[PDB]
Structure 1
Amino acid sequence: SQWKATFPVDLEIEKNSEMFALRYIKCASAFILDRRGILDEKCFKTRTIDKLLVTAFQSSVPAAKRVSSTFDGLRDAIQQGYLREFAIVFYKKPNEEDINEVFAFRFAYGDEGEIFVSLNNGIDTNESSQELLQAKFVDTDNTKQMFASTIKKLHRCIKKMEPLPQGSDASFRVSYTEKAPKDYTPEGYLLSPMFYTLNQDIRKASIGIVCGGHHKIQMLAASQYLKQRHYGRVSSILDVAG
């Protein structure tokens, strides 16, 4: 339950910054899928880091292993600086474009100047990408605290969510950087012309940015269940687990 048991340190190294970025979104995802009951509690194992309870996929369960494996394609996508956004979307079967809830993870590699706020889809806003740009890596132990701070607000947020209405499903959806060939799709994902789109009336939320030396990962969220070019996809997590 040392931080090192889950994450690497010396995040100034690009290599270590890499591994951190993946495991971060893999951990958050595992938490998100658990607390919103996309999968059985049996699919997850839990360790405690200092203050915080952090979740992992339980590879002893084949259903968990199958879902856990979708991320292995993303790891390759991140080394090559291809992955821009990784988002978990919720919908009611089978209106896969009628989004009810989304947890989005947006990336920034080695202080890229700026990112085009695309405006017909996604959760990305002008103010969001500003914060992402301005956010700076300081040191590993500062990032440890940024993590702690961020993951905490993630728990608070889901705590205030109304239950996920049955007959719902979830999808992994990814959007790419300009460095990525027009034909790239990570292992386990399928090509799709559709990212995701959100209603205007929906309540959004900024959960926080965490930074490695060469990668900056911002978490944004939106949900009905609160009181106040070229894409990739995994259509149904429920189906993957079976």
Structure 2
Amino acid sequence: SQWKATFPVDLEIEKNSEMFALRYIKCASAFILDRRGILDEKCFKTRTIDKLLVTAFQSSVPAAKRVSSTFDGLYDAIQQGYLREFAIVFYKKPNEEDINEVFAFRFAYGDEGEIFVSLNNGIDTNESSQELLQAKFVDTDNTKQMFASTIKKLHRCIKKMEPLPQGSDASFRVSYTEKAPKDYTPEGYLLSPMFYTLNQDIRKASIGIVCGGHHKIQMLAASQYLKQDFPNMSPYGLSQGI
């Protein structure tokens, strides 16, 4: 039930920061997929992290084990400094380009300096990239508190969303840093020329940035199901694992 049952401590250390970064995106993904109704409810279990009720995959369920396992190849992508963004996108087949909702996790490594703002795809903006640059590691306890604050804000955002359309589809999409080789593909993902693009008028929400010592992870959302821009108290990649 304590932090250390789920996440590393001593987050200033590179290996602990890496492991935290991967476990964090997996944790938030389970929270999101459960609350938005993507998989059957038996794919999830509620767990406790300090004062918060969070969600985990139930790996004894095949569909959950499949989704959980997609994260394994992202660990090497994070270790090598190759993962720039992990995004969960919701759409309706057959139109895989028409993104109704996205939850994006953008990474900054060490003190990278500045990061290119994409002009034609994604969710990032000049403002979001400035916020990611300005965020800084402070200490492990502070990251415990910022995790809690961020999950609470994610919960409040999702409470303001209308339900996904019946039978929505979901995919995981990833983009890479300039260090990654030209045809880089994490295990479990497929190489794709396509990422995702959003409509100019979609409503957006900035949920928060959590930091390990060597990794900063920014969560940004966009949805047609938010009305306006926005208890749990105790060279791209594609995965169609969902």
Shorter-normalised TM range: over 0.9
Structure 2: gaps (5+ residues): 229-235
Query: Which string of whole-angstrom CA distances, capped at 9 and with x for unpartnered residues, describes residues 97-134 of structure 1?
Result: 00000000000011100000011000000000100000
Structure 1: gaps (5+ residues): 233-237
Alpha carbons 2:171, 2:241 under 8 Å: kept: no
1:167 to partner: Cα distance: 2.5
Q: Could you say what secondary structure the match of 2:26 adopts?
A: helix
Residues 241/123 of structure 1: CA separation in 2 closer, same or farther (3 Å cut): closer
Alpha carbons 1:99, 1:197 under 8 Å: kept: yes
1:183 to partner: Cα distance: 1.1
Alpha carbons 1:64, 1:241 under 8 Å: kept: no
Q: Could you say what secondary structure the match of 1:99 adopts?
A: coil
- Relative to the length of structure 1, the TM-score reads 0.95
Q: Could you say what secondary structure the match of 2:71 adopts?
A: helix
Residues 12/130 of structure 1: CA separation in 2 closer, same or farther (3 Å cut): same
Q: Could you say what secondary structure the match of 1:175 adopts?
A: strand
Q: In 1, distance between residues paired with 2:144 and 2:62? A: 31
Aligned to 1:185: 185
Alpha carbons 1:63, 1:240 under 8 Å: kept: no
Alpha carbons 1:17, 1:214 under 8 Å: kept: yes
Q: In 2, distance between residues paired with 1:4 and 1:27? A: 14
CA RMSD of aligned residues (A): 1.5
Residues 137/75 of structure 1: CA separation in 2 closer, same or farther (3 Å cut): same
Query: Which string of whole-angstrom CA distances, capped at 9 and with x for unpartnered residues, describes residues 63-114 of structure 1?
Result: 1101110000101110000000000001011100000000000000111000
Alpha carbons 1:57, 1:65 under 8 Å: kept: yes
Aligned to 1:140: 140
Query: Which string of whole-angstrom CA distances, capped at 9 and with x for unpartnered residues, describes residues 3-39 of structure 1?
Result: 0000010001100000000000000000111011100
1:45 to partner: Cα distance: 1.3
Q: Could you say what secondary structure the match of 2:186 adopts?
A: coil
- Relative to the length of structure 2, the TM-score reads 0.95
After the TM superposition, which segments of 4 or more aligned residues of structure 1 sit over 3 Å from their partners? 238-242
Equivalent residues, number: 235
Residues 79/239 of structure 1: CA separation in 2 closer, same or farther (3 Å cut): closer
Q: In 1, distance between residues paired with 2:239 and 2:9? A: 36
Query: Which string of whole-angstrom CA distances, capped at 9 and with x for unpartnered residues, describes residues 174-222 of structure 1?
Result: 0000100001101111011110000011110100000000000000000
Q: In 1, distance between residues paired with 2:142 and 2:123? A: 27
Alpha carbons 2:9, 2:16 under 8 Å: kept: yes
Q: In 1, distance between residues paired with 2:240 and 2:211? A: 31
Identity within the alignment, %: 98
1:240 to partner: Cα distance: 5.7
Residues 188/241 of structure 1: CA separation in 2 closer, same or farther (3 Å cut): closer
Q: In 2, distance between residues paired with 1:18 and 1:140? A: 14
1:170 to partner: Cα distance: 0.5
Q: In 2, distance between residues paired with 1:9 and 1:46? A: 22
Aligned to 1:44: 44
Q: Does 2:88 correspond to 1:93?
A: no
1:51 to partner: Cα distance: 2.2
1:227 to partner: Cα distance: 1.2
Higher mean displacement: 106-115 or 41-50: 41-50
Map 1:14-163 → 2, pairs under 5 A: 14-163=14-163
Q: Could you say what secondary structure the match of 1:30 adopts?
A: helix
Q: Could you say what secondary structure the match of 2:239 adopts?
A: helix
